């Protein structure tokens, strides 16, 4: 297969729960193993922005997401926010790619400073020190200079700063089209196949 | 009235022509004078992403936009890309607020470095030197460190970096809902009334 | 009225005494209260460059300037260089806008470093810490990197660096026309009405 | 195969047209797809430094280069300098490696600042934001601090700064030997096979 | 003779066309060879601010300026904005001093970043890399932090930042006196004789 | 002659009055014009460290130094600390080289920040902005980071930081030998002939 | 004569021994005194890249180079790598210009940090502190950020970074043509006459 | 006793061997243990500047210095330049204060960058990492920006930069007086008693 076999998918409390759920769905359909983490604030965002009734405890949450996505047994692992025995907490784990989608300004800050206050933040700190893929999907407007300096620091260190800023150049007709645009960009960055966003200009041979 | 009487609205070649056209519409409905500028690349974006048939020359363009928006005579001024006799080119002009929406990465770069290669870039340079409002609405993903350093420089100098990253926390049901979210943020930043985005928590008195 | 009711006008020892005297005159004609400060070197510049016989002590100086400008009783206050009991010395004073015109390279340096060695320098330090308007009008050529770093530091902190560099785009016919150009820019920056410099392109509707 | 299937080859107006043409030839012989871009200044350099009569319009240019290189149908794509519908203009395109050879100091500047003023500059901006290979081949002497700061910024962000500085340690006997040295380094950097430059010390087992 | 035999004089689109024309006149009267460059925006400034009817094409322009200045045959060379075959485009040319007067904020930006988008910008880039004299005469007010950072960068690299800020300490009586002050400073910086501005204090022996 | 015709020699309140007096003597013997400045603190240093009874007022001081050095009429000019009519105060003066010897840490600070609080400091500020030679001779130990940052800033801008640190590699036999070493270095830096310090290795042809 | 009478020519272990030998030859033909230094690694490069059999000890080396170049008695001085009694080791020596050609990345590093570990490195440190000409000719590709930061530091301090990157704009026909291009640039930078590279555009009067 | 019991005294190849020998003498007379290190270049300096015939090998050198100073058995330890078994090479050694006197610009560079190429450089690196006293006594003039940046870095990290710049404010009468001034400053910095330099103003009670 192309792209990583395992993805750590962390959802934090920025707006855009639909992006994270659609990415999870696409990763499952590409037969990838997903290590799923979600912050307390992100659980409130999901309840506010969607009709998904996500259980609060990791195990109930794991069973729910497995059925919601049509995932195989053990394909989605759910780890709690202080579970340091989980693979993402150590660089000696098997290599994963990591995506934080959505990525709150608070999680952006924690990763930029190295706070490691929970498993999501420690997992990102591990990704950076092992030079494993780390994609951050912030959703915020305006961006202050605090936000921008944190994103610049992380981009300089190899993280992919991929804001939830969908493009319109394929004439989106629905909210789902715009959600899929951003998810397609994430999958492209990871090297995972997707057919939601065409390859721009692939049939374009010489200028008109 | 609240907010600026005159707004320089510049559209450049990032995806998201719908944002600029909706902002223009809202500014006209709030009885504001608009000094409208558009780059050659933005004209191609508009043709690609919308069914608006925008004429190419400023005068024909001015007549078209006046009818498209239901604007009054003289409410929308259109200036060409080398028209240094237009108000936005000099700081001795009457004060305007300026918005670049969408703002391409190329225009972001030009404003950050001071290139002043056309009227849009010179108008932004004037806004910064006179400390008049300047709002940039980039649409790009991922943001590279070049993009982020340019945005950070401008934010440090007082520009508002407002990416086209709509929020979902009012459960958008259409593309128009997401476009309106971003336009509402721009209007809020300018201090211009809008009723597309409620005032968060305004009815919330004490914690639950 | 538009713009500040009170302006601290400090003259320091750069060439261009005519700029400061013309600004004083315009501020008086706009019925503004002026807190007038002048350095010892600026008194020598004024004697060298003009026929104004300015008395040396604040009180005699106050009487002279009141008559020279046709100002009302108490409209021009003059404070000596060590008069820490004057309003500009403390941030608890009533808010003023401050202009240093001309601004010597030495006063530019003192303000950039925070030297507070006299009332002019302390008044500028107060303006910066209270985020009240501060406009500096340097007159120097070439600018060395020392000058430029000091101006850059202050501009980054919100000061308006407005060099005595008159424009020619209204075809000046006299020295007074060029002096008035710079004074008009200062008044524009403060938000005080002026009719010496037209609003560029105000009658320009669409490109030719 | 080893190395990228597709290479965006941009020629800009530095001296050394022979380097770009030889690289194009080698890429074609390694059965790679080439997206070929050339600036107006580079067309003048090619006319000055070679006897290649390169047609000016992309289509005529494409036919000429296909025959000049012995390339297959569709193996060389030529795109004009404002053809935003071409693959290199968007990060959603199929992944390419990009080489700017020769890279003028002006194109070096544009890429370092993010100017995106034409397809070459936008294509490099896309390469950087998608973290796809970007190789710059400047030809300039002396390098000023402006040149060096631009190269340092880009190298820090992952671009390969590969100056047109051929080595002599295999005793070159002709201009072609020196051209081939630089082209071999570019191919090595891309991971594309080449037999013009041996693998240094490959037969060297222990010190003498 | 004292000072450079050849001067590249570039006029760009800042206000102050009189400064450039007076400098040209003085350079011709000092029997210097002048390589004259002018931007499209500067041609509009000259038409707005003066009654000089400058022809648009280099050759007609060369004939006009030769007669306007009373210059000798071949003393004034005029080169077009894309004439890379002109001496200023290469560091292998005979050494010139270079002055950009007036220097727009856009040309200041281009030189600071190394844009080399036209012959003026490339000529300044060459001056810096060969460590040949480069004098920039900006005319702008206020200076923003973008302007100041660009001027500081160039001054740090050896360029002379000489703003069009005339002094009053010889009691100017006309616009021409103020124009001549700035031109005299430029000539002093180049080491070229001038008798418009006396040598300050030359007759002053001991303090009074 | 070789080297500058005129030297501004400023003595400030660091230890080492003998260095300044010996430099003055050597400059007079090389038939150079000297513009002599001395701070109040330096006058106290001279009284503490030498038996020279230097008069306090510039004119009496000028007569004394002329006789002390055997100088010609008008060869030594003395200017007071606030004499802005003296040549060193303006860049429009005839070009001088400037030496501050000894240079106190306070004068080092003032020059680095641009304080221009007296004629010595303004003269150094002028030297830097006109890119005329400026040599600083500090005498201090230890150097703090404040001292070092000020020296580094000035050295980066072209000033010569020449500490009063005599060498021993010609086997000095007296205090005068060590004083002469430092003075010889200053004269070498200015390009003025001296025979106190031989040209190292001038007779050395090939290694032993 | 034009240019320096004495040149310190240091060869270090970068590829391109032909550049250094050709420069030596040209300096001898222009009747210049050359203080010749060569590193141990450069001696190996010369043996690898040329058929010159250079003796290892300075004296034998001096005799060989004198005959190889047709130099006069004493025109070429050779100094060993620890000969601190040689002129280049002290700033009290007679002024030389210095060229390091080729300049290895290791010598570039040593000069940038001030290592002074041998006579070449100490001689460059002396050139920088005395503000005497220093030209570095690196030969390396790619340049890493370590290389670029070292070159940028030195260029900021006045060193000329002149990479061995020959131009093709006079249609070179042999390796010797390309070697001569770089040597001509070095001689131009030093101000020493050369007829290998014409003065670009010297006969070009007005644009075509 | 006051001050450190053990001092690592390193002499490197700057001029001023008399300073190091006098410091050694004073340390021995204060009954301190001295770990003595000397570079190869410093041995040449000592032979050039003094009549001390210092043996080359550590053991012979130790016997010589013990007699030269009148030191006790074992009071002076001499360690060779690669003797990593000596105490100064490790931070686990008993705490010493360290002085490099004289400190060449090359040793200043090595300590600033952390080169650790010999025992002197490693000993200074150890002093810095253990936060044990480190005093550097450079002797150089002019100081270049390379020298100044290295001194600034080390001073920021706690090293004492004490240049060999003797003061004259006690009217020195001999070379020995000036040598003793610098040595007294070193001893003062270490907290070791000395009676060569009085305590300034100790008898001064109130101002005159
Ligand atoms: C409904 C809703 C919507 C948003 C938020 C919250 C809630 C409840 N928050 C604020 C964010 O959750 C808060 O700062 C948390 O502290 C983030 O914590 P975590 O990073 O998720 O642990 C939030 N934060 C952000 O960066 N971007 C956003 O768009 C939003 N929107
Ligand atoms: C249809 C389409 C879509 C896009 C673009 C182009 C086109 C034709 N471009 C590229 C951009 O237009 C190009 O870099 C121009 O050089 C920008 O020039 P202006 O800043 O508009 O003058 C673009 N640029 C950007 O920053 N964000 C975007 O989302 C897009 N998308
Ligand atoms: C006639 C005349 C003209 C000038 C000056 C002086 C005099 C007497 N000075 C020098 C300046 O006054 C001096 O550096 C003072 O130290 C400035 O002190 P204040 O900042 O006014 O206290 C001066 N300074 C400056 O920055 N720009 C200028 O154009 C001039 N011109
Ligand atoms: C014959 C010839 C030779 C050269 C050039 C030009 C010409 C015509 N130019 C100058 C360069 O082309 C100019 O600055 C252009 O503006 C570069 O534009 P592009 O980057 O190609 O769009 C150039 N530029 C550079 O960086 N290195 C070089 O060696 C040369 N040599
Ligand atoms: C009449 C007039 C007057 C001015 C200008 C224009 C015109 C037409 N412009 C704007 C400037 O010309 C514009 O930003 C151009 O893009 C500069 O391009 P060049 O640098 O000349 O190629 C301008 N720019 C500037 O930096 N200072 C100024 O004083 C003025 N004034
Ligand atoms: C006898 C004597 C000796 C010294 C000093 C003073 C006196 C009276 N001062 C202190 C210095 O003079 C003081 O900080 C002044 O404020 C410097 O002012 P000027 O820079 O001369 O105006 C002093 N300053 C310094 O930097 N190096 C020194 O060696 C000395 N030594
Ligand atoms: C044949 C050959 C060729 C090269 C080298 C070596 C040899 C033997 N080296 C490596 C370089 O010599 C090495 O890093 C030395 O340590 C440089 O020491 P000096 O700076 O000469 O003392 C080298 N170094 C470099 O910077 N550029 C180059 O092109 C080469 N090429
Ligand atoms: C007689 C004599 C005099 C001096 C020197 C040398 C010699 C032989 N050197 C140069 C210095 O010794 C050289 O750069 C060495 O490489 C320094 O190596 P160490 O730091 O001692 O290992 C030297 N270096 C320095 O920084 N200041 C100085 O005053 C002198 N003077
Ligand atoms: C073992 C755990 C939980 C963290 C340690 O992982 P490492 O830092 O990568 O060695
Ligand atoms: C007059 C025009 C077109 C630009 C000058 O405006 P300013 O720079 O604000 O003085
Ligand atoms: C009261 C005086 C003179 C200064 C104190 O003012 P503040 O610093 O703003 O509290
Ligand atoms: C579609 C075009 C031409 C540019 C947009 O590409 P992206 O910035 O990578 O989303
Ligand atoms: C030859 C032209 C037009 C530019 C090349 O000049 P150089 O960069 O100085 O070698
Ligand atoms: C005229 C005096 C005293 C200072 C002004 O000199 P300038 O700053 O160089 O124009
Ligand atoms: C004397 C030698 C070998 C070096 C000292 O030279 P200086 O540093 O320039 O005083
Ligand atoms: C033991 C030796 C020679 C060096 C190790 O010392 P440390 O670095 O301080 O642990
Ligand atoms: Na914690
Ligand atoms: Na421009
Ligand atoms: Na004070
Ligand atoms: Na652009
Ligand atoms: Na360009
Ligand atoms: Na002052
Ligand atoms: Na060393
Ligand atoms: Na080592």
Author numbering:
A (entry chain A), B (entry chain A), C (entry chain A), D (entry chain A), E (entry chain A), F (entry chain A), ...: 1 to 208
List sentences from the manuscript:
Originally thought to be redundant but distinct decarboxylases, it has been shown that UbiD is in fact the only decarboxylase, whereas UbiX produces a cofactor strictly required for UbiD activity. The UbiX enzyme catalyses both the N5–C1′ and C6–C3′ bond formation to generate the fourth ring of the prFMN product.
To further investigate the N5-prenylation step, we determined the reactivity of PaUbiX with a series of monophosphorylated compounds resembling DMAP. Interestingly, even the DMAP isomer, isopentenyl monophosphate (IMP), is unable to initiate any flavin alkylation reaction. We determined the PaUbiX:FMNH2:IMP ternary complex crystal structure, resembling the catalytically active PaUbiX:FMNH2:DMAP complex. This reveals IMP is indeed bound in a nearly identical manner to DMAP, located directly above the FMNH2 isoalloxazine plane. FMN reduction is also accompanied by a minor decrease in the distance between FMN N1 and a water molecule. Crucially, no formation of an N5–C1′ bond can be observed, a process that occurs rapidly upon reduction of PaUbiX:FMN:DMAP crystals. Thus, a dimethylallyl moiety is essential for reactivity, as neither saturated DMAP-like compounds nor the isomer IMP lead to N5 alkylation or prFMN formation. The lack of activity with all but DMAP(P) substrate (or GMP) confirms the first step is an SN1-type prenyltransferase reaction dependent on formation of a dimethylallyl-derived resonance-stabilised carbocation.
